[PDB]
Design a protein around this ligand. Sequence first.
Ligand SMILES: NC(=O)[C@H]1CCCN(C(=O)[C@@H](CCc2ccccc2)c2ccccc2)C1
Ligand SMILES: [Zn+2]
Length: 140
Amino acid sequence: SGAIYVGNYRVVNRHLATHNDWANLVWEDSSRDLLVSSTTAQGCDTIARCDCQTGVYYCSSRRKHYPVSFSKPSLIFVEASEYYPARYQSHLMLAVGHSEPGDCGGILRCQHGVVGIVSTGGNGLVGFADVRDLLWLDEE
Ligand SMILES: NC(=O)[C@H]1CCCN(C(=O)[C@@H](CCc2ccccc2)c2ccccc2)C1
Ligand SMILES: [Zn+2]
């Protein structure tokens, strides 16, 4: 579990959005596993605007922040699960690191800000849904 809070936005994994998030929807993309909902209060997160491939992510299954190298956002094959059929997930970055399903929502950060949130994994790999191309998160 976990979310990004920037301005009047809550960014969460689409497969984990609560009923309250759907009743206050801004934008969603099934192919990226992202959903953005409106918030009454202002958030403090700054989104990174860069091409960094090294950062630190939070892993709830180990209660640890791990430094990692990660790939460029890409269309990656994600196996069928209870949340989606077998498909290509876009804007996904992989890293060698421990991750388990309950780790989704963990933030990945670089020196510039929030890069993305855990969305996939397994096999000593962890995948992050990128949010750095969502330039509109920095306005209104
Ligand atoms: N974005 C998605 O479509 C997610 C939805 C939840 C499930 N997804 C994952 O990647 C799972 C592992 C799936 C798996 C298990 C066993 C064998 C082959 C695959 C996972 C593991 C670790 C961290 C986060 C998620 C896909
Ligand atoms: Zn950066």
